[PDB]
From a paper:
Transforming growth factor-β (TGF-β1) is a multifunctional cytokine with key roles in development, immunity, cancer, and fibrosis. Latency of mature TGF-β is determined by non-covalent association with its N-terminal prodomain cleaved by furin during biosynthesis. Interestingly, both TGF-β1 and -β3 LAPs contain the integrin binding motif RGDLXXL/I and bind to two integrins, αvβ6 and αvβ8, which together account for the majority of TGF-β1, and some of TGF-β3 function, in vivo.
In most of the structure, the resolution is sufficient to resolve sidechains for reliable atomic model building (left). The local resolution of the density map and the temperature-factor (B-factor) of individual residues obtained from real space refinement of the model are consistent. We further subject L-TGF-β1/GARP to 1 μs all-atom molecular dynamics simulations revealing clear correlation between the per-residue root-mean-square-fluctuation (RMSF) and B-factor. RMSF measures local structural flexibility and dynamics. Thus, local resolution or B-factor provides quantitative measurement of relative flexibility of specific regions, which clearly show half the straitjacket domain (including the lasso) is more flexible (enlarged view in the upper panel) than the analogous portion of the other straitjacket within the same L-TGF-β1. In the case of the fully latent L-TGF-β1, the straitjacket and lasso loops are relatively stable, as opposed to the partial latent L-TGF-β3, where the same domains are flexible.
Residue numbers in the entry:
A (entry chain I): 26 to 112, 116 to 280, 312 to 591
B (entry chain B): 1 to 60, 72 to 198, 206 to 210, 224 to 240, 261 to 361
C (entry chain A): 3 to 59, 73 to 132, 134 to 197, 202 to 211, 221 to 240, 262 to 299, 314 to 361
């Protein structure tokens, strides 16, 4: 075995029993991955100085009683993925100084766990995941008061008798993910701070009512369950995180301190007005992939602290969000909905909006003071705080002259809007602010914008368009990458794009009908600072 | 954090009444129950009651894997030909019992035994039937088949589970079936080499050993639970319902043996979302008045006899 | 109508369910060890056995209506009489049309025989279009009985084609089986004689009524890829399925499941597999593995 000062690290394979040739002064011993089929006390007892002992992933089945009692200084024992459940009553004797014990993967079952272990006064962490535990009887976690973290995921836990966690006053972390629980009738773990009940079959979740003591839960994960309702979390004031995603939660303060609510994939069709009041101080609200039809946050002071609002892939038809209501909203996701007509100043009233995704909708912009548009248009012309906008697949046929004249955004995407007739100077206000622009799949015949005039532009995309010539560059370009795939481009002379090479480092021309003879300087551009 | 203790049937029963009323109305294509008062009071006529009694009255594990094995028919050259050769209308498939018992060491283990034949005759329709060798002389009928013509060879499957089990437990050295042409009182295959064989399927000898989904009783009387007088027969029926939530059990490569049996009662079908649903149902015949003539009608899949997870 | 499915999660749920299902059906505590599996292909006999086992080999109510047999003394005794061989029955086809006017309305029809009282008797049911016609329907093995009992043959198609093109009088023949190398059973009406005679208990649709969602989804299972199992030798994965989709509140529908219905399989097909348990190979068949079609219940 490899040797280090006061530490022995036996390799993955090669040993059948615990070696007897190691120094008695060994303080750390690693034997994981080996064919050790048992732990007899005689060879192991020589190393009383052991503090860590990794027997993980061995074939151990029989532990001789008193084997781990002799190592008074042992602090961490790892028996993960062994064959303990095929056994040694009291196989693990008393463990006065063991701070961590890993038993996951052994396929321990209810009843054998209660006799396999012994007194462990100083146990801080216990891992029982990937076992065959089915029931948490009254007598499961006795004789370990100092436990602070308990791991029980990937088990088959269906039942939990009242008071199974009564012997764990200091527990702070309980992980019951990927278990078989089906209905939770109570919650009285005042000490607990993290609870993971995700990936279970829970149809209902309930807690204590009008308790005489406070609760310390801060992180509840109740997702991918069968929950049919939003749980009554009035007794959990300190909850900070809540992820009810992938449930069946139809909707018909308790959550004043919740900061991150994930309520997506929950068959929700309506958000009652009283609901959003309880979510004061919320900072993230994910309502994606619901059957929601309209968002009605018209009340002043609704969701004051919300920084993100995700409503993607709903059936949303209109937004009733009020002026100065979503004050702190930085990001608003709305892709995949059915927005057609809105009040012109819907998104302009969002005081601190920074990113707006409208892909897959069918909204139509308008230019405000320059070239006013029809009724029902949405006024992007004056969203001062906006910095990134997406209008992909909005079926916009005509873009107005003053579409973004007073919105200094940094990135704009208009891709896959077939037949987009860009009015001359439509993007005029973005010359000194925009850094990335995309117009892929528009099919437009000519660029109706002074593209070199965009001093701040860094990247551009014009792929899958009928374009034939580019506006004439005449100075050192701030552009860095330019994408021109599948277009009708025939020539790229220096008079048309010279000056790009000062900052350009990547180019795409494949699929275009370049003149085999007249391309000229294109071959030299391909030498350095170009590709394909 | 204790698990949910009990289920209140006093709500689910009424919620079943609500749905079964609608099912009764829908099965008869009725928007609302008909008016009962117009028809004069009196007994249902005797012939109609006889019809209603004719329809009412009676007339006349699989989850765990099964090891499959096959025993090939003896050669026709030595055991079969000498006394039961092939005739114009019959064939005789004989099997060795010693190797049959070798395939399945105990008769209790046998779950299924399919005698399989391959047919070369293609186009001529024929009626053929299967008999057991029952004694030194006699034969007993198993089953028959109508050979729908087809242009290509095809495999026939005859279920012989009971015969094969009887053969394992009491059979002699040599035994077999007769497959012969149908004929009345007033009036081919390979081997007669892909020859017929018995595809036995048995449990391996090494493997011989209010919450869960179940059917729960409910009796409905049309007069008081649904408040109906228009339905005259029967007075009520047992619309028992299924309850007991089936939890999804998250699998794992290494599982304790007594926990591997939890799948067979909570998720036998390996569904992504199991639910406790009816498995077996039988109809409810009724008599009722619309217009001025009684109507005897059969409503299908009304009673619940078993429930299963998905 | 409303649904919020994550198809990927449903698929992974079924993958991890197939893992546990395969391991539980075989009652394997853990995947079998491959440490002593012989090299090379499977034995010829094992592959032959695997191929041998692998190869292939209404909602709405019905109107109940009896129609009685013609009196045996009136139309049957003129040409046929009960004998040691067979009993003969005939029905007024005009009465059948009166009970059920058009073929498209019939759903089920069964000839309700009554046995007065003996010995294990094999009886078969024929057609009789005419005296020279022969057409078999079905048969039953009647065990000895201590009491009279009704017995029925499902005869739906014959009655439907009678309604389509039947004449005036036609019927059946009930014959004792003739092993090719006697009608001891006694029937009512061919000895009380005049009533409880054989009849058809027709089921039909009345004229006043006669006039994506849950479906099977495709999901291939590759043992070596998505489960990581090296111990299943054939098949190299099998073409399992699942099903999904909303069910509105259907041939076998009944709302007695819960407050909302479910999309569940109706037809499932077994999966034969071959694998090595230590040194020797074993061919097993697992039932209810491959989803073919699904109900709403």
């Amino acid at each position: 075995c490899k040797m280090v000062d006061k530490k022995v690290s036996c390799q993955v394979l090669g040993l059948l029993q615990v070696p007897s040739v190691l120094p008695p002064d060994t303080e750390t011993l690693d034997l994981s991955g080996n064919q050790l089929r048992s732990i007899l006390a005689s060879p192991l007892g020589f190393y009383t100085a052991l503090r860590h002992l990794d027997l993980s992933t061995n074939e151990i089945s029989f532990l001789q009683p008193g084997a781990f009692q002799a190592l008074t200084h042992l602090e961490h024992l790892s028996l993960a993925h062994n064959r303990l459940a095929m056994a040694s009553a009291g196989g693990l004797g008393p463990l006065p100084r063991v701070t961590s014990l890993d038993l996951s993967g052994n396929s321990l079952y209810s009843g054998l766990l209660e006799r396999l272990l012994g007194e462990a006064p100083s146990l801080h962490t216990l891992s029982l995941a990937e076992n065959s535990l089915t029931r948490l009887t009254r007598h499961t976690f006795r004789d370990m008061p100092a436990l602070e973290q308990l791991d029980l995921h990937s088990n088959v836990l269906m039942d939990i008798e009242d008071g199974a966690f009564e012997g764990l006053p200091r527990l702070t972390h309980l992980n019951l993910s990927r278990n078989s629980l089906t209905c939770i009738s109570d919650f009285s773990l005042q000490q607990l701070r993290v609870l993971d009940l995700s990936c279970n079959s829970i149809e209902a979740f309930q807690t204590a009512s009008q308790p005489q003591a406070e609760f310390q839960l801060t992180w509840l994960d109740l997702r991918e369950n069968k929950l049919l309702h939003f749980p009554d979390l009035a007794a959990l004031p300190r909850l900070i995180y809540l992820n009810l995603s992938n449930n069946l939660i139809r909707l018909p303060r308790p959550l004043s301190q919740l900061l991150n609510l994930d309520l997506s994939y929950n068959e929700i069709e309506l958000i009652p007005d009283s609901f959003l009041e309880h979510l004061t101080s919320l900072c993230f609200l994910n309502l994606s992939r619901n059957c929601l039809r309209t968002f009605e946050a018209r009340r002043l002071g609704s969701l004051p602290c919300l920084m993100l609002l995700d409503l993607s892939h709903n059936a949303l038809e209109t937004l009733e969000l009020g002026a100065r209501a979503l004050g702190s909203l930085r990001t608003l996701l709305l892709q995949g909905n059915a927005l057609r007509d809105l009040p012109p100043y819907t998104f302009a009233n969002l005081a601190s909006l920074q990113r707006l995704n409208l892909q897959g909708n069918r909204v139509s912009p308008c230019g405000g003071p320059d070239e006013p548009g029809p009724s029902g248009c949405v006024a992007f012309s004056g969203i001062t705080s906006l910095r990134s906008l997406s209008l992909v697949d909005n079926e916009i046929e005509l873009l107005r002259a003053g579409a973004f004249l007073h919105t200094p955004l940094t990135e704009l995407d208009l891709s896959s809007n077939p037949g987009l007739e860009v009015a001359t100077g439509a993007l005029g206000g973005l010359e000194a602010s925009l850094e990335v622009l995309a117009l892929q799949g528009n099919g437009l015949m000519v660029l109706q914008v002074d593209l070199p005039c965009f001093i701040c532009l860094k990247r551009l995309n014009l792929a899958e368009n009928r374009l034939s010539h580019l506006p004439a560059w005449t100075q050192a370009v701030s552009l860095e990458v330019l994408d021109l795939r599948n277009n009708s481009f025939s020539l790229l002379p220096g008079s048309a794009m010279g000056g790009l090479e000062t900052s350009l480092r990547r180019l795409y021309l494949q699929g275009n009908p370049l003149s085999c003879c007249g391309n000229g300087w294109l071959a030299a551009q391909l030498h350095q600072g170009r590709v394909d | 954090l204790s698990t949910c203790k009990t289920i209140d049937m006093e709500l689910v029963k009424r919620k079943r009444i609500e749905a079964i009323r609608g099912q009764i109305l829908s099965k008869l294509r009725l928007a609302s129950p008909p008016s009962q008062g117009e028809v004069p009071p009196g007994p249902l006529p005797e012939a109609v009651l006889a019809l209603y009694n004719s329809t009412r009255d009676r007339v006349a594990a699989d989850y765990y894997a099964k090891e499959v094995t096959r025993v090939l028919m003896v050669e026709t050259h030595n055991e079969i030909y000498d006394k039961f050769k092939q005739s114009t209308h019959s064939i005789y498939m004989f099997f060795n019992t010693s190797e049959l018992r070798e395939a399945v060491p105990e008769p209790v283990l046998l779950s299924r035994a399919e005698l399989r034949l391959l047919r070369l005759k293609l186009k001529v329709e024929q009626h053929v039937e299967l008999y057991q060798k029952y004694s030194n002389n006699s034969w007993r009928y198993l089953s028959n088949r109508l050979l729908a013509p087809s242009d290509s060879p095809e495999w026939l499957s005859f279920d012989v589970t009971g015969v094969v089990r009887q053969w394992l437990s009491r059979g002699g050295e040599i035994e077999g079936f007769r497959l012969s042409a149908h004929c009345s009182c007033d009036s081919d295959i390979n081997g007669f080499m892909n020859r017929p064989f018995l595809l036995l399927m048995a449990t391996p000898l090494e493997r011989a050993q209010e919450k869960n989904c179940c059917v729960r009783q409910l009796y409905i009387d049309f007069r008081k639970d649904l408040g109906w007088k228009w339905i005259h027969e029967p007075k009520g029926y047992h619309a028992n319902f299924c309850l007991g939530p089936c939890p999804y059990i998250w699998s794992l490569d290494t599982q304790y043996s007594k926990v591997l049996a939890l799948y067979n009662q909570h998720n036998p079908g390996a569904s992504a979302a199991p639910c406790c649903v009816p498995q077996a149902l039988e109809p409810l015949p009724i008599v009722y008045y619309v217009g001025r003539k009684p109507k005897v009608e059969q409503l299908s899949n009304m009673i619940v006899r078993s429930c299963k997870c998905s």
